[PDB]
Amino acid sequence: FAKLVRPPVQIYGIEGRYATALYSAASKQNKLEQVEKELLRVGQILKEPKMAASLLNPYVKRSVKVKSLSDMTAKEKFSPLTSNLINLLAENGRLTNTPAVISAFSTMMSVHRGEVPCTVTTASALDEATLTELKTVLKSFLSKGQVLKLEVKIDPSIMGGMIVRIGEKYVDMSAKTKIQKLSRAMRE
Amino acid sequence: TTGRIVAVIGAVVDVQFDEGLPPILNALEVQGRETRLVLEVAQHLGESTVRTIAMDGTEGLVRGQKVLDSGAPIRIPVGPETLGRIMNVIGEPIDERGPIKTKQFAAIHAEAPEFVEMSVEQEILVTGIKVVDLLAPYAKGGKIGLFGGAGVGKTVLIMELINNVAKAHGGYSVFAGVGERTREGNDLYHEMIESGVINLKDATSKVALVYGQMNEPPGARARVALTGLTVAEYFRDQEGQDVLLFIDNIFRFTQAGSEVSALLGRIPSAVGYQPTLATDMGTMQERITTTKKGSITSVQAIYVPADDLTDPAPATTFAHLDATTVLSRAIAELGIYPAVDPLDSTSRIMDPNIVGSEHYDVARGVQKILQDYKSLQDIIAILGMDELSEEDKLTVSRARKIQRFLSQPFQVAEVFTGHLGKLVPLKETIKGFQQILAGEYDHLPEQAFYMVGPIEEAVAKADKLAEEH
Amino acid sequence: TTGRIVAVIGAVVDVQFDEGLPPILNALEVQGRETRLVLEVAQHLGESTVRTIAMDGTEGLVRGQKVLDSGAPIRIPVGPETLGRIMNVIGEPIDERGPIKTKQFAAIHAEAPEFVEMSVEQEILVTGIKVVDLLAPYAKGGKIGLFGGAGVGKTVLIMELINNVAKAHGGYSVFAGVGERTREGNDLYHEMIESGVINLKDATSKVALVYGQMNEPPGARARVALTGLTVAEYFRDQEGQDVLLFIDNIFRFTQAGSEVSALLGRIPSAVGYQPTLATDMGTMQERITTTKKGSITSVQAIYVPADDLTDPAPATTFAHLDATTVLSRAIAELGIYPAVDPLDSTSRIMDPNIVGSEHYDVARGVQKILQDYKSLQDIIAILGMDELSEEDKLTVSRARKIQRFLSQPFQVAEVFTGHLGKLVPLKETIKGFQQILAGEYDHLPEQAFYMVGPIEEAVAKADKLAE
Amino acid sequence: QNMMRQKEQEHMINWVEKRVVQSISAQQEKETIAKCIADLKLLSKKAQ
Amino acid sequence: DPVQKLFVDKIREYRTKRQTSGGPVDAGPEYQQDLDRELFKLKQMYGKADMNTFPNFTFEDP
Amino acid sequence: AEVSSILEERILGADTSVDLEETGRVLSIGDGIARVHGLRNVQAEEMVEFSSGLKGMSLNLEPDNVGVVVFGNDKLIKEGDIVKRTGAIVDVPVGEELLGRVVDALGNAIDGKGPIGSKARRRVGLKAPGIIPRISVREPMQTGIKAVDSLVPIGRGQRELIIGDRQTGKTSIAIDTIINQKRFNDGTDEKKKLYCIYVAIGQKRSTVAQLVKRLTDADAMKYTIVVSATASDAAPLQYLAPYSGCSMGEYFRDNGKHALIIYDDLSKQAVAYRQMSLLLRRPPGREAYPGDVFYLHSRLLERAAKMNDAFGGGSLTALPVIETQAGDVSAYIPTNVISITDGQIFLETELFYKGIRPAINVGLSVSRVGSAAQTRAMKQVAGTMKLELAQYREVAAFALDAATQQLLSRGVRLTELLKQGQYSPMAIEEQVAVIYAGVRGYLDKLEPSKITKFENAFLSHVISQHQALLGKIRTDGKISEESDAKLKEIVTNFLAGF
Numbered sequence A: 001f002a003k004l005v006r007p008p009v010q011i012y013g014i015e016g017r018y019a020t021a022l023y024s025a026a027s028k029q030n031k032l033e034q035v036e037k038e039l040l041r042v043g044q045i046l047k048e049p050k051m052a053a054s055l056l057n058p059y060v061k062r063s064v065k066v067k068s069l070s071d072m073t074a075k076e077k078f079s080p081l082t083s084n085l086i087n088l089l090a091e092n093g094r095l096t097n098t099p100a101v102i103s104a105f106s107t108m109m110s111v112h113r114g115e116v117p118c119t120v121t122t123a124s125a126l127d128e129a130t131l132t133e134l135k136t137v138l139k140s141f142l143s144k145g146q147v148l149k150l151e152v153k154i155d156p157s158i159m160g161g162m163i164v165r166i167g168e169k170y171v172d173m174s175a176k177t178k179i180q181k182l183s184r185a186m187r188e
Numbered sequence B: 001t002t003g004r005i006v007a008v009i010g011a012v013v014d015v016q017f018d019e020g021l022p023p024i025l026n027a028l029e030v031q032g033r034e035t036r037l038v039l040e041v042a043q044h045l046g047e048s049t050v051r052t053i054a055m056d057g058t059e060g061l062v063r064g065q066k067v068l069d070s071g072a073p074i075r076i077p078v079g080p081e082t083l084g085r086i087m088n089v090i091g092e093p094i095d096e097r098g099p100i101k102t103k104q105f106a107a108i109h110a111e112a113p114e115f116v117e118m119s120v121e122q123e124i125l126v127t128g129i130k131v132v133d134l135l136a137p138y139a140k141g142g143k144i145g146l147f148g149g150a151g152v153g154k155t156v157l158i159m160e161l162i163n164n165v166a167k168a169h170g171g172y173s174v175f176a177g178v179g180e181r182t183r184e185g186n187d188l189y190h191e192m193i194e195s196g197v198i199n200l201k202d203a204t205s206k207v208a209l210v211y212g213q214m215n216e217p218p219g220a221r222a223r224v225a226l227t228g229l230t231v232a233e234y235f236r237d238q239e240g241q242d243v244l245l246f247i248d249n250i251f252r253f254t255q256a257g258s259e260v261s262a263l264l265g266r267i268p269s270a271v272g273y274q275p276t277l278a279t280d281m282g283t284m285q286e287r288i289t290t291t292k293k294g295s296i297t298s299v300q301a302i303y304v305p306a307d308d309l310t311d312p313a314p315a316t317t318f319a320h321l322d323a324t325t326v327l328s329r330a331i332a333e334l335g336i337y338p339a340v341d342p343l344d345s346t347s348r349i350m351d352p353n354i355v356g357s358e359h360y361d362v363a364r365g366v367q368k369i370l371q372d373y374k375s376l377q378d379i380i381a382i383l384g385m386d387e388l389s390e391e392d393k394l395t396v397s398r399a400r401k402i403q404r405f406l407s408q409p410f411q412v413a414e415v416f417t418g419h420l421g422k423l424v425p426l427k428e429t430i431k432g433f434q435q436i437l438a439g440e441y442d443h444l445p446e447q448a449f450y451m452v453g454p455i456e457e458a459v460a461k462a463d464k465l466a467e468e469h
Numbered sequence C: 001t002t003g004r005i006v007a008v009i010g011a012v013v014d015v016q017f018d019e020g021l022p023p024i025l026n027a028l029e030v031q032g033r034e035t036r037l038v039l040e041v042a043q044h045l046g047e048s049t050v051r052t053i054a055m056d057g058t059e060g061l062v063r064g065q066k067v068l069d070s071g072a073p074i075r076i077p078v079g080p081e082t083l084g085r086i087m088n089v090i091g092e093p094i095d096e097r098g099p100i101k102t103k104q105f106a107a108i109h110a111e112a113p114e115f116v117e118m119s120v121e122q123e124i125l126v127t128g129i130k131v132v133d134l135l136a137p138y139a140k141g142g143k144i145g146l147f148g149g150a151g152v153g154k155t156v157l158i159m160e161l162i163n164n165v166a167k168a169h170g171g172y173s174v175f176a177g178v179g180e181r182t183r184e185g186n187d188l189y190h191e192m193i194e195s196g197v198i199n200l201k202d203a204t205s206k207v208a209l210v211y212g213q214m215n216e217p218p219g220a221r222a223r224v225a226l227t228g229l230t231v232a233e234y235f236r237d238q239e240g241q242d243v244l245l246f247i248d249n250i251f252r253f254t255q256a257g258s259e260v261s262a263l264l265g266r267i268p269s270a271v272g273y274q275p276t277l278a279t280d281m282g283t284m285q286e287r288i289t290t291t292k293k294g295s296i297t298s299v300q301a302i303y304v305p306a307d308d309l310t311d312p313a314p315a316t317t318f319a320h321l322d323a324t325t326v327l328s329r330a331i332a333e334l335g336i337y338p339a340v341d342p343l344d345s346t347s348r349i350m351d352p353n354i355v356g357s358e359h360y361d362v363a364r365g366v367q368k369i370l371q372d373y374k375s376l377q378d379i380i381a382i383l384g385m386d387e388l389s390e391e392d393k394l395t396v397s398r399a400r401k402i403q404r405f406l407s408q409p410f411q412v413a414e415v416f417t418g419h420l421g422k423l424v425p426l427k428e429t430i431k432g433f434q435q436i437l438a439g440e441y442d443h444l445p446e447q448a449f450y451m452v453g454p455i456e457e458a459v460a461k462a463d464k465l466a467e
Numbered sequence D: 001q002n003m004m005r006q007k008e009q010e011h012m013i014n015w016v017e018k019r020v021v022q023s024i025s026a027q028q029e030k031e032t033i034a035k036c037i038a039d040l041k042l043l044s045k046k047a048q
Numbered sequence E: 001d002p003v004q005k006l007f008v009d010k011i012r013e014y015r016t017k018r019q020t021s022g023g024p025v026d027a028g029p030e031y032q033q034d035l036d037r038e039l040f041k042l043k044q045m046y047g048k049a050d051m052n053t054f055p056n057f058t059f060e061d062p
Numbered sequence F: 001a002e003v004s005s006i007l008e009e010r011i012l013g014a015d016t017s018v019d020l021e022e023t024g025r026v027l028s029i030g031d032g033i034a035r036v037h038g039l040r041n042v043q044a045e046e047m048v049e050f051s052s053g054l055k056g057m058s059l060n061l062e063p064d065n066v067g068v069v070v071f072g073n074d075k076l077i078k079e080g081d082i083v084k085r086t087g088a089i090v091d092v093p094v095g096e097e098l099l100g101r102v103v104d105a106l107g108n109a110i111d112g113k114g115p116i117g118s119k120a121r122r123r124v125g126l127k128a129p130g131i132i133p134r135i136s137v138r139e140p141m142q143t144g145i146k147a148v149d150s151l152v153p154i155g156r157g158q159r160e161l162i163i164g165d166r167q168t169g170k171t172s173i174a175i176d177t178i179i180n181q182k183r184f185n186d187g188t189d190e191k192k193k194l195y196c197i198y199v200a201i202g203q204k205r206s207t208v209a210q211l212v213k214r215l216t217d218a219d220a221m222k223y224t225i226v227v228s229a230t231a232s233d234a235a236p237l238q239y240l241a242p243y244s245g246c247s248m249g250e251y252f253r254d255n256g257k258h259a260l261i262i263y264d265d266l267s268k269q270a271v272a273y274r275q276m277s278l279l280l281r282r283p284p285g286r287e288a289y290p291g292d293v294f295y296l297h298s299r300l301l302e303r304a305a306k307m308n309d310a311f312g313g314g315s316l317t318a319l320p321v322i323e324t325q326a327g328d329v330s331a332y333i334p335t336n337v338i339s340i341t342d343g344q345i346f347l348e349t350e351l352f353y354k355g356i357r358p359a360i361n362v363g364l365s366v367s368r369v370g371s372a373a374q375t376r377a378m379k380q381v382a383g384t385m386k387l388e389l390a391q392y393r394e395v396a397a398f399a400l401d402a403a404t405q406q407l408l409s410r411g412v413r414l415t416e417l418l419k420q421g422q423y424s425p426m427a428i429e430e431q432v433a434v435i436y437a438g439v440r441g442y443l444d445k446l447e448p449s450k451i452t453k454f455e456n457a458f459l460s461h462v463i464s465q466h467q468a469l470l471g472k473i474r475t476d477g478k479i480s481e482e483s484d485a486k487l488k489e490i491v492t493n494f495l496a497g498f
C-alpha cells in the first residue's frame, strides 16, 4: 500500500481515520495550510440551516447529496483534496460526523505547527504581570519552537494555590490538595 | 524493520509498523526489556498493524515501545549440543549452565511431511507392561496416546516408559513438558541425572529437554510443543536415526490456544474452544511422523477434562494416534495400576497378521471375558453371587483374576506401593493370560495375582499367602 | 445543575449536562411530571452524558425534557417518626397519613462498617420452631436466610418468625418488602394494626415498613432494600438499639439489577445475570451486620429460581449468612410443614461450645439417622423395604418418625388448616428427639408424630388413634 | 480510656480541618502565588 | 520548611486547639450523647461489679 | 493531652515534594472501570492514582484510551477527572513487620493498631521460580488433623487442595493447620517454624473477625498474617488479594524461612476476575469466565515452591480452598485447580452428616508426595492403617465369617479413631500413639460408640504419666523396638484399666 505519512497526534475513531487519510494526502504534495483553510470554510458552508437540513435527512438519496456537494465545491473553488474528501464522506454517508473530522484535523494541524495546550486553574483571577511570568516559565517547560496555548480557567472549588497542565504534565500546588494530604496524614 | 507497540491486552500485543509489515508467524523482539520478550505475529489487521501473542509476560510494556523484526520465525538451537540441556519455547537455556553452542538454528514452524514420505511398516514395540503389550501393543515409529483425567497415572506411566524404552534405546530422545507442574519438571531432571541419561560432565547425554510449564503465559505453552517437535524433527532428519518424543500433556497446547483466541477476535465454537481447534492440532500432530528418512516414536499424555472422552480436544486427538491407552479412574479406584482400561484401549497393529494368532486370540479372549463380566455385574446387583449359574461364577472368577493380573508394579512407583518394579517379556504375558483363561489356575485366590510380574510370581505369592494363612 | 434527556430506553435514561456533571449515585429530578420521578445516576459516558436508572415509570418522558440535579443521593427520612409508617423507595409515605416528620435524613448509599467495628458475640435466638431450633439454631445479631422455590413456605415461615420473635422483642423492627405481593403487604399492615404492633393514634409503634412490591419498575425494586437497610441502620448506629430487619424477597433485589444491567450495556455473565452480581450483593449485605454500635438480626427470604440451588443468585447469597434454612418442595409434598430440609440447613452456632452437649449430640444423631435413611431411599424405592436388614428397618422407622416429628403447626397457619399454633421451647424439643432417638417410642405409629407440639402430644395423639 | 483517647483524637482532627478550611479563605495571594511560580521555576530547571 | 503556609497554618490551629481544650470545644450534644452511649455499652459488656476497689469472692470449699 | 501531641508528630513530617507528573482525563467511569485518556507512557498493569487519593491499575492499553480498574469505591470518580501515573507495577509491603496484622489486599492495615513498618516492597505479579531452584519436597507440614497427617500427608512446598461443598469443614481444616504451628513456632529451632498467611476472599467481614479472634484466642497471631479482601471490596481487590498474600509468602521462602498460605476461596477470585474482565469488555468464555481463567490460578499456585539449599532452603506451602456445587467436582474452576495442584482433600456432606468429621473422603483424597514428607513413625503406622481402611471400604456396603467380620470391626474402629474436634490439633507423636493403639488390634474388643472416649482419655493419660515416651518418639522420630515395647505395655495396661 501507499506508505502514508503519520500525523503527529494520533486521533482515533471514524473521524480519526478520515482525518489521518486527509493529513497523509495533504502532507505529500504539501497543501496542509490551504486544505485546513478550506476545511474551516466547509465548516460554515455545510452549517447553513438549509444545507444542514438537506444533508441530515437520510431519505434524500446519496446521489443527490453527492451532486449537491459537488455543486457547492465547484461554486467555492477548493483544492481537489478537499473536494474528494467531501465526496468520500458523502458516499460513505459520514456527513453527520463531518465536523468531528474538521475538529480532528484542527487538533492534528495545531500539533503539526507545534502547540502544547495548557491549562491554569486558580481560586481567583490573576494580575497580568503574574500571567506574564507564568507565560515565561511555562515556555521554559516546553521545547524549541513549541508555541504555547494558555487557558486560564477559574475554579473556586479549590481554596487557593495553582493547578497547571502542560500537555500530559501536571503540577498541582493547590491549597485543597495540601489540606487533603495533611488531613489524611493526621488520620493515619 | 522497526515497529511500535500500540496496544497491550492480556497476552495479546498489537504492534504498528511504519515501514513494511512482517509476515505472519515471524518473531519480533521488544526493545527495552531486561529479559528477552519475543512476540509472534498472528494476524495482519490492516492499517499496518499486526496482532501478536507474547511468548512471555507483557508486564511493563508501554504503548510506543520499539520492536525489532527478526525476519524469521522463532529459531531454536538444534544439534547434539542441546542434549542434556533444558530450553524455553524460544530456545534459550533454563538449566543455568551457559549458552547452547550449536551451529544450526531451526525454525519451529515447518510444513508437515508430504504423502510420498510415509512409512507403512509396523512392528510391535515391547514396553514391558502387561496390559499395554497384550491389549494395545505399541509400534516403533507410531504415535501413542495416554488419555485419562487427572490423578489416574499419566505422568507415572510416561515416566515408566522413559525408564524402560529410553534407557535401553540406542537413539536419542526428547521430552517436551507443555503446561505441566514445574515440580514434575525438576523431579524428572534430577531422576535423569541420577539414572545417567543426562550427563552433566561428559558429552554423553541421551535426552534433550524442553519445558514450558503452567506458569508461562499462553503464548509460550502454545509453542513449546513446536519447539520440542523441532528438536525431534532435526534428530530425525539430519542425524538420520531413531528418536523418541515424549510430550506431557498435549492438551495444554490446545488449551493455551483457547486462552488467546477470544482476544484475537475469533468467535468461540463448541464448548468454548477456538474455531481452529482441529486445524491447529493437525498442523502440529502432522509433523510428528515416521517418514522414510527417520523415525519418531511419539508418546503423548492427553488430559481429558473431567474424564469426559467426548470433549472436543481428546475427541479430536483420537484420530491422530495409532495406539491409545485410555487410563480410567473407575479402575484406579479399585487399586489396579496402571489403570489402563482394557476395553477402551486400541492399537493399529493389533491384528492377527502383525502380532500373531496366539497373541491376537489371547487378547480377544481377555477382552471378551471382561465384557461378559461387565454384563454379569448388572445381574449380581439384584441376585447376588450366591445365585449365579455355576458356569457364570466361573466367568466372574476368571474375569477378576484377569483384572488383577493386568496390574503391575513399576520401578518408578516404588515410593507409593513400596513394592519392586517388574518387567514382563511379551511371551510371559501371553502365556500368563492364556493359562488364566484356560483354567490352569482356577484354584489360586484372586489376591495372588494382584501386583506381580509373570504368572510364576503369582503362584509364589499364593504359596506365601497359604503358608502364612 | 440542568441537563436534558437524550435517550429513554426502558427504565434507563440518558441525561446530558453541558455544565457541571453530577457524581455517581447522585439523584436527579425530572422536571415536568405529575409526580416525583427520581433518576439515580449510574455511569458517566463521556461527552458530558450520564446514564441513570429511573425510580418510577418512565412513560411520558420526552427527549429533550429537563432534568435538575439534586446534589445528594436519594435521602430518605429516618428517625423514630418512621415507626408505624409505610415508605417507598424515595422515602415518600404511601399510607396516606401525612408527611413523615423527621429532622434527620439519611442517604441510602452509605458504606459498610469497617473491620474494627464487627462484634464477635454469638448467642442463640429461640424461635419456638422444632426444626429451626434443633438442627439450624438461629443466632442473635446474625444474618439468617430462608431458601426455597415458589410456594414452599418462605412467607408463612417469615410471618411465624415475625409473630414469635418480634412479639418477645423489646427493640424496634423493620420489614422491607422488596418484590413481593402487594396484598401480602396489606395483610401484614392490617395484622400489625390489629396486633397492637402499630398505633395509628399514638407513638408506641415498633415496626417500620418499607415496600417496593412487584408492581413497581426494575429501578424501584433494586433500590428499596437499601431504603430498608438505611432505616434499620439509623436505629442501630444512632439510637444504639437492637433491631430486627425482615426482608422478603431479597432475590428480587438481584433480579431487578439483571433487568437494568442489560439496558446499561453490560456483557451478561453466567445465566444472563449482570456481571456485577456478587459485588452488588456484597455491598448490600455487608451493611446488615451487627457492629459494636448495635445489633441487627436480619431474616431474609431468598427465592431459588426453578428450585435450582446451583443458580448464581442463591449460590452467592449462601456465603453471606450465618444460618440457612433450605425449604424444600420435595418435603412439602409429603405434607411436612415447615418444609425445612434438615440436611441442607446449617448454622454457625451449631457448636458444642455454644448450644451444649445434649443439644449438639441430639442434633448430630438426628442428622446421622436422616442421612442413613436418605442413603437407603434409592434401594427402598425399587427393591422395596423388605430387602433390608433389621438394623436398616429400625433406621427407616426411626427416620420416618423423626421426619414427621420435625413438622409443626404454626399459628399463622391456623386459618389454613384449623389446627392450633404451637411453640416448643428448646428443652422440650431436645428431650423429645432424645426419646425418639433412644427408641422409647418404637411402639407408636409414625403418623402419631405428624404435626404436634411437644412429644407428649404425640403420645396423646397415638392413644387417640388407638380408639 | 483508649475509647476516649480515640474519640477526642477524631474530634481534634475534625475541628482543626474545619478551622483551616476557613482560615485559608483569607488572601495571602501575592506571596503564595509568587512561591508557586518559584516552584515552577525550580521544576522547569530541574526537568531537562 | 518555614514556607509551607498550609503546614504552619495547620500547626497554628493545632496550637489554638491545645490552649482552648479546657473543655471539649464545639462539643455539642452529640459529644455527651455518644460518650454516654459507648460508656454504657462498655459497662454492659464488661460487668457490673464494684467498679472502684476489689470485690471479694468468699468461695466455698469442696 | 499527649494524644494531640502524637497527632502533631504526624504533621511534623509531611510530603512537601510536588513533582511534574504525567496524567490523563477520565473519559468515562462506570461500574468500577475508568477509561482514561492520556497516560501515554503508562505501563501494563501499572498502579495509577486518582485525584481523590484512590488507587487503580491500568489493565487495558488500547490505542485510544487506557482501561483502569479502581481499587476501591467508584462513586468518587467523575468524568474529566485526573489520573496520575505512579510509575510502579502493583506491589505490596513485605516483611516480618506484617505478622499478627490484618491487612487488606493492598497491604494497608485494617485493624487500626497503627501502620505497617515494612521496609521493602514486592511486586504482586512475579514469575514463579524456575526448574533449577526447587528441590523435591522433604519435610512434613504438620496439619494436626489425624486423617490428613496419616492418610493424605502434606509436605512443605506442596500445593494441597481443599475442595468440597459449602459448610463441610474447609476453613476448619485451614484454621487447625494454622493453630497447630504454634508448638513449632514457640520452640527454638528455626527449621520448623512456619509462618502462616490466610487470604480471605469474598468472606463477609464478620467471618474474618470471628476467624481473627479465634486465632487470637489460640495465641496464633504471633506468626499469622490475614489478608482480607471481603465481599464489600471492589472486584479489583478480591482479584489481587491472592497475589498480595503470595508475595508476602514469597518474601519468607526467598529468605530461608518457611511459609504457609491459604487462599480461601479461589472460586471467588475467579468470580472477581470474571467481573473485571466483563466490565473491561473482554469477550467471555465458558460459563462467562474469561479465557485466561486457568492462567489466573496456574501462575498463582506455581509460586508455592521448595527452594534448594543454594537458594536459602525456604519453602512456601499452599492450601487453596475451592467450593463445588452439590459435589459437582466436574465443574470448570474445580477441574482447573484440580489439574493445577498436587494432592487434594475431598470433603463430602454425606460424610459430614454421617458423623465423620472432618469429612475427608480418604478414598478419593490424594497426595503426590505421599511417602516422602512423612515422619518415620507415621510412615510405619499409617501404612498399615491405609491398607486396613482400603480393605474395609470394599466390604462395607453391607453389615459373617470370623475373618471378614473382624476386618469390618477393625475398619470401623479405625474410622471412629480418625474423627476429631475443632481447633484442637494433636502433636504428631500423639497421633502416632492413638493410631498405633487403634491399628494393633487393641480396640477390637471395645465397642465402637465408645472409641472416642478411649481416644480422649488415653491422651490425657499419656500426656501426663508418659511424657518421656512421647518426647522419645518426637526426638528420635521413629517407633524403635524399645519404644514399641513400651507403647505395647502402656496400651495393654490402659485398655484393661478403663
Ligand SMILES: Nc1ncnc2c1ncn2[C@@H]1O[C@H](COP(=O)(O)OP(=O)(O)OP(=O)(O)O)[C@@H](O)[C@H]1O
Residues within 6 Å of the ligand: C319, C347, C348, C349, C350, C351, F165, F166, F167, F168, F169, F170, F171, F172, F173, F357, F358, F420, F421, F422
Ligand atoms: N471436625 C469438626 N467437628 C465438628 N464440627 C465441625 C468440624 N469441622 C467443621 N465443623 C462444623 O462445620 C461448620 C462449617 O465449618 P467451616 O466453616 O470450616 O466449613 P466451610 O465449608 O468453610 O463453610 P463455608 O464454606 O460456608 O465458609 C462449622 O459450624 C463447624 O461447627
Ligand SMILES: Nc1ncnc2c1ncn2[C@@H]1O[C@H](COP(=O)(O)OP(=O)(O)O)[C@@H](O)[C@H]1O
Residues within 6 Å of the ligand: B149, B150, B151, B152, B153, B154, B155, B156, B157, B337, B338, B410, B413, B416, B417, F366, F367, F368, F369, F370
Ligand atoms: N503405578 C502406580 N502405582 C500406584 N499408584 C500410582 C501409580 N501411578 C499413579 N499412581 C497414583 O497417582 C498419583 C500420581 O498420578 P499422576 O500420574 O502423577 O497424575 P496424572 O496422571 O493426572 O498426571 C500418585 O499419587 C499415586 O498415588
Ligand SMILES: Nc1ncnc2c1ncn2[C@@H]1O[C@H](COP(=O)(O)OP(=O)(O)O)[C@@H](O)[C@H]1O
Residues within 6 Å of the ligand: C148, C149, C150, C151, C152, C153, C154, C155, C156, C157, C337, C338, C408, C409, C410, C413, C416, C417
Ligand atoms: N406451616 C404451614 N402449614 C400449612 N401449610 C403451609 C405452611 N407453610 C406453607 N404452607 C402452604 O404454602 C402456601 C404458602 O406459600 P408461601 O410460603 O406464601 O409461598 P412463598 O414461598 O412464595 O412465600 C400456603 O397456601 C400453604 O398451603
Ligand SMILES: [Mg+2]
Residues within 6 Å of the ligand: B154, B155, B180
Ligand atoms: Mg501429570
Ligand SMILES: [Mg+2]
Residues within 6 Å of the ligand: C154, C155, C156, C180
Ligand atoms: Mg411469599
Ligand SMILES: [Mg+2]
Residues within 6 Å of the ligand: F170, F171, F172
Ligand atoms: Mg469457610
